[PDB]
RNA sequence: UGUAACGGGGCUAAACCAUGCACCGAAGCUGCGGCAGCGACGCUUAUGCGUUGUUGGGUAGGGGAGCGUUCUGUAAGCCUGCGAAGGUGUGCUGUGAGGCAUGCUGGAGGUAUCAGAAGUGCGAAUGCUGACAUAAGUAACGAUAAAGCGGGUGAAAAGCCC
RNA sequence: CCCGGCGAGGGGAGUGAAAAAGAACCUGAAACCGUGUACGUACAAGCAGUGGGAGCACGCUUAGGCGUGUGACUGCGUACC
C-alpha cells in the first residue's frame, strides 16, 4: 500500500522552523540549516541551565563584596563572621538587601565583626 | 479610492525594473510622469504606460478628478521566465533564463 | 521495467554521480526496489482450532442471549414484504438466520435485505456469527450442528 | 577563480545600494511656449530659450 | 518551446609525478 | 516591612500582600499554611536577624493555586556519534499569598 | 523575585580626581580599573557601566620599582612590515607622558564596548591643572 | 463481545525490527550489521 | 610575517620558602520537588498501596515499550455544505514520537474504538526529476571590410524602404 | 465602456454560489523574490546562537503586573555528515 510521506514530512519540517524564528539569514528559512540551528540551540540550553546558576552566583558575590568593603570588611572575612554567628542568610538575599535596604546590611556587619572579635 | 493597474509578463527582469520603481515611490503623479519621461530606460516606458493606464482608470471607471492623485505603491514582482538554449563552446550548453516581471502601480489621492 | 541496459554515462570523467542503469530505483520512472508478486495470504488453521473457536462463540452467544431457537422459520411466498413482516413480529432487525436445510423461499426473500443473511446449518462461519447483532437458528439445525461439533 | 560559499541576499541587496539612478533635479521652462525641458536642450516642439529654432 | 540538454565531457591536464 | 524565610531549600524576601511563587506544597488550593521557620524579620529600621531562625517568627500565607511552570525542552546530542536525545519537563509550583507577619 | 539590575538611565556617576605622584603604577591602576568598572558599588552589574569618572593629574611623576624604568619595554606594531616600534619608560614619560597610565589601564579593563566605554571615563593630564572644575571632582586617596 | 473488541493474548504478537528508520529506533543507519564487514554487504556473508 | 620562553596587564611581592585561618571554585556532594528501572519485604498482590533500599553518560550491539502515515473489517455506523480533506495561524496538552481545539483559506469528504496488513517515517548516497537561487546586471553580443546623410512609412527608425 | 500601438496587458461592467473559479482557469505549500509597518544597525571583530538584559513598540489588566515583537549590552560557546 503506497504511502505518500508528503503530509507528515511537511509537518515535521514546519514544526522545526517554528523554534528557529528570529535566527539570521537561512537559519530561519531553510530546513537543513534550521534543523542544525535548533539542535545546537538545545545543546546550549542544556549546558547553560547550569551556567545560569554559575553566572548568577558570581554576580551576587560581587555586589555583596562591594557593600561589605563599603562597610570596611572583605567578603572572605564577612562570610566567616556569619558562619561563626550561626547565621543562615543566603547570598541572593544579602545582595538584594545590600542594594535595596542598606541600613539592615550595615546592621549585619556589626554582628559579623562581633563574632570575629 | 485606490485604483490598481498591472502589466503582467512584461519583457524585462524584475531586478532592472525595481531601480526605476524605487525612483517614483511616494511622489505626485504630475512629477511622476515628468521623471519617467526623461528617464533613459525602456523599463521606464513600461512603467509610464502602466502609471498612465492607472490614471485613466482613476479618472474614468472609478472617480477622481486630477492633480490630487499620487502614487503610493509600485511593487514589481517576478513573472514566468521562458527557458531558451544558447550553445556554448566545446559542446557545453546553457539554460538562458529570459526573465519577465509584473509591474503594479497603485495610486490613491490620499 | 522497460528500458535499455546501457550505462547512462561513463563511470569516471564526468562531474556527476555514478550511474549504471536507467532502471535504478533511485531514478524517476525506475524500478520498485522490492516489487510485489502475486501472494497467497491464506493461513492454516487446525480443524480443532476452528471447532474450538466455534464452540467458544456459540457458548458466548448463549451467555449474552443473542441466540434464539425456534421450531420453524419459513415464508409461504418469495416476497421480501412477507419476510419483513415476520422479522418485525419477532422484533429483529439485524439477524442471521440458520436453517437445517436451505429453503428457496427464505433465500429469495432475504437476498435484497442487507441486514439479514440466510445460511444453511453446515454453512456457518465465525465472522458472520460475530458480525450480526443477533443469530436465530432453528431447532432441527441444533441437531446437525451438535453432531458436527461433537 | 570561483566562489567558495554562496553570498547571501543581504549582501546582494547591500551591494546594489549604489546602483540607484538619480533623477533630474529640475527642468527648465521655455520663455515662449512654457513647456518643461532638460537644461541646455531644445523642447519637444523645437523651442529653446524662448526662440523657435526648428520650423517644425 | 522545445529546449533540451547535452554533455559529453573531455579529459586532459598536466602531470602530478614529482 | 518585609521578612526572609526558607521554605523549599531556598529563601525568599516577601512583604505583606505580595504574591510569591514557591515549590509545590501538598496543601489544598483553598487553605491556610503556616511557616514557623522564619529566618529574618525586618520592620523598616529594626531587624531580628535570626541566628538561626528568629524565635518569634511567624509567616502567615494563603495558598492561591497549584500549577505547572513553562515548558523546558531538554536536548542532548553528541555530534558525529549517532547519538541524540530530547525530553520535556514542566516543574510543579504552588503560589501563596503572604497575609501576616508577626514577631 | 528577579535580581536587581542597574538601569543605565538612572545610574548615578560621580567625579573623582586622583594625583599619581610617587605611587606604584600597577597598584594605582588597579583602583582606577576597579572604580571605572563599578566593583566598589553595591549596584554593580556586569553588563551595565556603573563606574565613576576619574581625572588623573601629574601623570608624568608616576613611579615604578626595580630597574623597570630602563628594562620594561613597550612594543607596538604599525601593521606595516618592519613597523615594530619600542620606547623605554623614561622616553614615553618625556615624549608623551599620559601614554603610560592609559595603556596600562586600557589593558587592565575587560576587552569590548564596555571596556572602551570605561576607558573614555578617564581624563589623564600630564600637569597639575585640569579644566573640569565645573564637575567639582572629589579628591580620592589611592 | 464484538469483532471490534477482540485482542490477541498478551505476548502472542511481538513487534519487528524494521531497521534503519531513525536514531531513536536503535537499529538505524546500520541495521545491527556493524561496520563494513561481509555481513554489512548486500548479499554478503560466508557459506555454511 | 609581530612584542610572542607569565594568557595579558601589571607586580619588588601581585615571586619563592615555611606555618596558619578565610573565601572562590563542577552537571561531584547536600537540600526541596518530579519521572523511570530493579531488588526483598508490610498488607494486598494479573491491580496496587507513608512502600522501602538502591539505580538512570554512552558508539558497535542486545533487550523492552510506544507514536504517527496508506489501506481492511468494525462501518448501509460515526462526523460533515450550520463546512470535510489539505493549507496557514493561535492556544492548550503529554517524558517523547505527538495529541486536542480553535480563527482564516479551501471547498467535499472524512472517520472513533480495537483488531489486521504494509511500497510505514529521509538531510546527507559527486542520489533521481522538477522548481528556484548564487556568481550577476559581471563575461559575452561570432572575424578591425566602415560607415554617413536626407526624405518616407510608422506608436516608436543607428539597423527597414528610397 | 476606458488606457494602450485598430497591440500585449490591465481597469470597470456583466455572467456565476464563487472569477478568493477568466481559459498561464480546482486547491495552491516550500525554497526563492518583493511592498508596508514595529524595533535594532555606520569605533565595530569570529558557526551568528543560548543565559541574563535595558530601552522602544504593542496587546490585556488596573497601577498586581503579565503577554507579544524587537533587542543595545553581557557570560558561555569553533556547523552537520
Ligand atoms: Mg554549583
Ligand atoms: Mg560542435
Ligand atoms: Mg514506473
Ligand atoms: Mg481440512
Ligand atoms: Mg544502540
Ligand atoms: Mg548484528
Ligand atoms: Mg573497519
Ligand atoms: Mg558505512
Ligand atoms: Mg562488519
Ligand atoms: Mg529525589
Ligand atoms: Mg543509559
Ligand atoms: Mg519507504
Ligand atoms: Mg526531502
Ligand atoms: Mg544521516
Ligand atoms: Mg564536484
Ligand atoms: Mg541530496
Ligand atoms: Mg513539471
Ligand atoms: Mg551594460
Ligand atoms: Mg565580478
Ligand atoms: Mg567588468
Ligand atoms: Mg566587456
Ligand atoms: Mg557581428
Ligand atoms: Mg537615417
Ligand atoms: Mg516595439
Ligand atoms: Mg470541486
Ligand atoms: Mg579605540
Ligand atoms: Mg555606534
Ligand atoms: Mg565582522
Ligand atoms: Mg570562549
Ligand atoms: Mg567567542
How far apart are alpha carbons G57 and B6 in whole angstroms?
73
Residues by chain with Cβ below 5 Å of ion ligand 6: H 32
Nucleotide nearest to H2 (CA to C1'): I74
Q: Which ligand is located closest to the Cα atom of residue G111?
A: 26
> Going by beta carbons, is chain G in contact with chain B, meaning 3 or more pairs sit under 8 Å apart?
no
Residue of A15, A20, A38, A90 for testing the chain F interface, max F β-carbons within 10 Å: A90
Distance measured from the CA of protein residue A49 to the C1' of nucleotide J51, in angstroms: 7
Alpha carbon A49 to chain centroid distance?
A: 7
**Chain B positions in Cβ-Cβ contact with residue E7 (cut-off 8 Å):** 91-93
Which DSSP string corresponds to chain H?
--TTS--PPTTSS------SS-TTTSSTTTTT--SSSTTTSTT-----
- Spell out the SS3 assignment of chain C: CCCCCCCCCCCCCCCCCCCCCCCCCCCCCCCCCCCCCCCCCCCCCCHHHHHHHHHHHHHHHHHCCCEEEECCCCCCCCCHHHHHHHHHHCCCCCEEEEECCCCHHHHHHHCCCCCEEEEEHHHCCHHHHHHCCEEEEEHHHHHHHHHHHC
Nucleotide nearest to B15 (CA to C1'): I137
**Residue C11 CB-half CA count within 13 A:** 0
Closest alpha carbon to C1' of I124, residue: A32
How far apart are alpha carbons H7 and G128 in whole angstroms?
98
Q: Which parts of B are annotated binding residues for L-tryptophan? A: 90
- For chain G, how far is it from start to end, CA to CA, in angstroms? 38
C-alpha cell at A100: 535595596
Query: Apex CA C109: angle with CA C106 and CA C114, to 5°?
Result: 110
A4 touches strand J (CB under 7 A): no
Contact B95 E3 (CB under 8 A): yes
Which H/E stretch holds residue G18? strand G15-19
Distance from CA of E18 to the nearest CA of B (A): 31
Strand partners, B32: none
Ligand 10 centroid to residue C44 C-alpha, Å: 54
Distance measured from the CA of protein residue B23 to the C1' of nucleotide I38, in angstroms: 76
Distance from CA of H34 to the nearest CA of C (A): 23
Domain ranges, residue D41: 1-55
Distance measured from the CA of protein residue G35 to the C1' of nucleotide J75, in angstroms: 21
Question: What nucleotides of chain J have any atom within 7 angstroms of a protein Cβ?
Answer: 1-4, 7-12, 24, 29-36, 43-45, 47-55, 64, 69-76, 79-81
Domain ranges, residue C26: 1-149
Residue of E5, E6, E9, E10 for testing the chain C interface, max C β-carbons within 10 Å: E9
Domains in chain C, number? 1
Q: List all residues 6 or more positions away from A18 whose beta carbon is below 8 Å from its beta carbon.
A: none
Say which CATH number the domain at C126 has.
3.40.1370.10
Burial of B9 (0-12, 13-18, 19+ CB in 10 A): exposed
List chain B domain ranges: 1-110
Ligand 23 centroid to residue D54 C-alpha, Å: 18
Interface B–D counts its CB contacts (< 8 A) at 18
- Spell out the SS3 assignment of B23-72: CCCCCEHHHHHHHHHCCCCHHHHHHHHHHHHHHHHHHCCCCCCCCCCEEE
Listed in sequence order, the DSSP H helices in chain G are 25-37, 68-71, 89-95, 99-106, 113-120
Q: How was this one solved? A: cryo-EM
DSSP code for G134: G
Domains in chain D, number? 1
B3 touches strand I (CB under 7 A): no
How far apart are alpha carbons B103 and B8 in whole angstroms?
7
- Closest listed residue to residue G119, CA positions, set G109, G129, G128: G109
How far apart are alpha carbons A17 and A11 in whole angstroms?
10
Chains with ≥3 CB–CB distances under 8 Å to D: A, B
Burial of A62 (0-12, 13-18, 19+ CB in 10 A): buried
Residue linked to cell 536503535: H26
- Spell out the SS3 assignment of chain D: CCCCCCCCHHHHHHHHHHCCCCCCCCCEECCCCCCEECCCCCCCCCEECCEECCCC
Touching check for D49 and chain B: CB below 8 Å? no
- Closest listed residue to residue A100, CA positions, set A46, A74, A64: A64
How far apart are alpha carbons A94 and A86 in whole angstroms?
15
Resolution, Å (one decimal)? 3.3
Distance measured from the CA of protein residue G34 to the C1' of nucleotide J76, in angstroms: 23
**C-alpha dist (Å) from residue A5 to A12, A36, H27:** 11, 22, 21
Q: Which residue of H has its CA nearest to C133?
A: H2
Q: List all residues 6 or more positions away from B12 whose beta carbon is below 8 Å from its beta carbon.
A: B42, B43, B46, B99, B100, B101
Q: List all residues 6 or more positions away from A56 whose beta carbon is below 8 Å from its beta carbon.
A: A92, G3
**Chain A positions in Cβ-Cβ contact with residue F84 (cut-off 8 Å):** 39
Ligand 14 centroid to residue A31 C-alpha, Å: 14
Domain covering B1-110: architecture: Alpha-Beta Complex (3.90)
- For chain D, how far is it from start to end, CA to CA, in angstroms? 57
C-alpha cell at F21: 511563587
- Residues 50-69 of chain B sitting with CB below 7 angstroms of strand J: 52-53, 56-57, 60-62
Pair B74, B29: CB distance under 8 Å: no
Nucleotide nearest to G111 (CA to C1'): I8
Interface F–G counts its CB contacts (< 8 A) at 3
Pair C82, C75: CB distance under 8 Å: yes
Pair G69, G88: CB distance under 8 Å: yes
Pair C11, E6: CB distance under 8 Å: no
Pair G24, G64: CB distance under 8 Å: yes
Amino acid at each position: 500500500a503506497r504511502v505518500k510521506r508528503g503530509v507528515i514530512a511537511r509537518a515535521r519540517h514546519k514544526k522545526i522552523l517554528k523554534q528557529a524564528k528570529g535566527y539570521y539569514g537561512a537559519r530561519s528559512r531553510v530546513y537543513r540549516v534550521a534543523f542544525q540551528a535548533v539542535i545546537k540551540a538545545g545543546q546550549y540550553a542544556y549546558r547553560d541551565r547550569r551556567q545560569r546558576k554559575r553566572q548568577f552566583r558570581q554576580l551576587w558575590i560581587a555586589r555583596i563584596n562591594a557593600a561589605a568593603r563599603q562597610n570596611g570588611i572583605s567578603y572572605s572575612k564577612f562570610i566567616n563572621g556569619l558562619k561563626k554567628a550561626s547565621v543562615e542568610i543566603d547570598r541572593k538575599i544579602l545582595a538584594d538587601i545590600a542594594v535595596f535596604d542598606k541600613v539592615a546590611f550595615t546592621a549585619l556587619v556589626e554582628k559579623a565583626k562581633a563574632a570575629l572579635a | 479610492m485606490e485604483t490598481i493597474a498591472k502589466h503582467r509578463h512584461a519583457r524585462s527582469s524584475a531586478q532592472k525594473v525595481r531601480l526605476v520603481a524605487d525612483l517614483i515611490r511616494g511622489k505626485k503623479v504630475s512629477q511622476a510622469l515628468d521623471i519617467l519621461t526623461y528617464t533613459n530606460k525602456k523599463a521606464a516606458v513600461l512603467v509610464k504606460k502602466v502609471l498612465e493606464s492607472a490614471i485613466a482608470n482613476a479618472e474614468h471607471n472609478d472617480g477622481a478628478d486630477i492633480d490630487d492623485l499620487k502614487v503610493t505603491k509600485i511593487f514589481v514582482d517576478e513573472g514566468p521566465s521562458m527557458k531558451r538554449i544558447m550553445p556554448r563552446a566545446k559542446g557545453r550548453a546553457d539554460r538562458i533564463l529570459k526573465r519577465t516581471s509584473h509591474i503594479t502601480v497603485v495610486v490613491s489621492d490620499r | 521495467v522497460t528500458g535499455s541496459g546501457k550505462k547512462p554515462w561513463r563511470q569516471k570523467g564526468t562531474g556527476r554521480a555514478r550511474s549504471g542503469s536507467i532502471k535504478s530505483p533511485i531514478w524517476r520512472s525506475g524500478g520498485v526496489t522490492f516489487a510485489a508478486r502475486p501472494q497467497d495470504h491464506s493461513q492454516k488453521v487446525n480443524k480443532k482450532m476452528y471447532r474450538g473457536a466455534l464452540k467458544s462463540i456459540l457458548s458466548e452467544l448463549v451467555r449474552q442471549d443473542r441466540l434464539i431457537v425456534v421450531e420453524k422459520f419459513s415464508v409461504e411466498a418469495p416476497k421480501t414484504k412477507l419476510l419483513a413482516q415476520k422479522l418485525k413480529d419477532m422484533a429483529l432487525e439485524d439477524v442471521l438466520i440458520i436453517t437445517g436445510e436451505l429453503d428457496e423461499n427464505l433465500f429469495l426473500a432475504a437476498r435484497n435485505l442487507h441486514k439479514v443473511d440466510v445460511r444453511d446449518a453446515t454453512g456457518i462461519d465465525p465472522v458472520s456469527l460475530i458480525a450480526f447483532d443477533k443469530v436465530v437458528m432453528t431447532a432441527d439445525a441444533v441437531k446437525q450442528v451438535e453432531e458436527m461439533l461433537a | 577563480a570561483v566562489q567558495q560559499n554562496k553570498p547571501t541576499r543581504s549582501k546582494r541587496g547591500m551591494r546594489r545600494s549604489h546602483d540607484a539612478l538619480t533623477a533630474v533635479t529640475s527642468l527648465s521652462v521655455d520663455k515662449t511656449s512654457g513647456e518643461k525641458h532638460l537644461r541646455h536642450h531644445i523642447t519637444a516642439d523645437g523651442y529653446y530659450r524662448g526662440r523657435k529654432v526648428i520650423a517644425k | 518551446x522545445x529546449x533540451x540538454x547535452x554533455x559529453x565531457x573531455x579529459x586532459x591536464x598536466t602531470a602530478s609525478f614529482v | 516591612m518585609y521578612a526572609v524565610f526558607q521554605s523549599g531549600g531556598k529563601q525568599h524576601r516577601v512583604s505583606e500582600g505580595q504574591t510569591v511563587r514557591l515549590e509545590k506544597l501538598d496543601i489544598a488550593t483553598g487553605e491556610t499554611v503556616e511557616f514557623a521557620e522564619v529566618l529574618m524579620i525586618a520592620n523598616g529600621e529594626e531587624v531580628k536577624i535570626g541566628v538561626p531562625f528568629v524565635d518569634g517568627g511567624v509567616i502567615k500565607a494563603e495558598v492561591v493555586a497549584h500549577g505547572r511552570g513553562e515548558k523546558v525542552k531538554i536536548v542532548k546530542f553528541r555530534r558525529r556519534k549517532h547519538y541524540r536525545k530530547q525530553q520535556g519537563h514542566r516543574q510543579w509550583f504552588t503560589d501563596v499569598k503572604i497575609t501576616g507577619i508577626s514577631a | 523575585m528577579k535580581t536587581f539590575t542597574a538601569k543605565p538611565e538612572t545610574v548615578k556617576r560621580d567625579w573623582y580626581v586622583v594625583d599619581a605622584t610617587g605611587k606604584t603604577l600597577g597598584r594605582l591602576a588597579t583602583e582606577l580599573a576597579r572604580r571605572l568598572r563599578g566593583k566598589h558599588k553595591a549596584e554593580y552589574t556586569p553588563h551595565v557601566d556603573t563606574g565613576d569618572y576619574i581625572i588623573v593629574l601629574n601623570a608624568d611623576k608616576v613611579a615604578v620599582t626595580g630597574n623597570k624604568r630602563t628594562d620594561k619595554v613597550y612594543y607596538h606594531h604599525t601593521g606595516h612590515i618592519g613597523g615594530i616600534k619600542q620606547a623605554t619608560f623614561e622616553e614615553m614619560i618625556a615624549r608623551r607622558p599620559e601614554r603610560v597610565i592609559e595603556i596600562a589601564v586600557k589593558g587592565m579593563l575587560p576587552k569590548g564596548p564596555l571596556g572602551r566605554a570605561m576607558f573614555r571615563k578617564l581624563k589623564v593630564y600630564a600637569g597639575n591643572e585640569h579644566n573640569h572644575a565645573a564637575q567639582q571632582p572629589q579628591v580620592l586617596d589611592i | 463481545m464484538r469483532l471490534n473488541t477482540l485482542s490477541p493474548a498478551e505476548g502472542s504478537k511481538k513487534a519487528g525490527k524494521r531497521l534503519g528508520r531513525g536514531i531513536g529506533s536503535g537499529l538505524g543507519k546500520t541495521g545491527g550489521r556493524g561496520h563494513k564487514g561481509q555481513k554489512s554487504r548486500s548479499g554478503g556473508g560466508v557459506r555454511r
